[PDB]
Design a protein around this ligand. Sequence first.
Ligand code: A1BN7
Ligand code: ZN
Length: 139
Amino acid sequence: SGAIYVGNYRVVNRHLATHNDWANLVWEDSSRDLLVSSTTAQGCDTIARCDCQTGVYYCSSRRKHYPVSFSKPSLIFVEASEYYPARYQSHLMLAVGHSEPGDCGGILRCQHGVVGIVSTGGNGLVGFADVRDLLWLDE
Ligand SMILES: NC(=O)[C@H]1CCCN(C(=O)C(F)(F)c2cnsc2Cl)C1
Ligand SMILES: [Zn+2]
């Protein structure tokens, strides 16, 4: 679990969105596993606007943060799950690091701010849904 709170927006994994997120929907994209909903309170998270390929992510299944080197956002084949059929997920960044299903939503950050959230994993890999291209989160 986990979300990004920036301005009047809440960014979560689309497969973990609640009834309230869908009732306050701003934008969603199944191909990216992202959903954004509106909030009444102001969020103070900062979104990175950079091309960093290193950062630190939070791993809830270890209660620890880990440093990572990750690939540029790209289209990656993801196996079928109870939430989606087998498909290419876009804007996904892979890295070597521990992750379990409940780790989805953990933030990846670089020195410039929030880069994305955990969205896939397995066998010593961790994949992050990028949010740096969503310029409207601030403007
Ligand atoms: N973005 C997706 O399609 C997710 C949906 C939930 C299931 N997906 C996963 O990768 C996983 F949860 F099974 C997993 C396994 N080990 S670490 C993680 Cl994260 C794909
Ligand atoms: Zn950066």
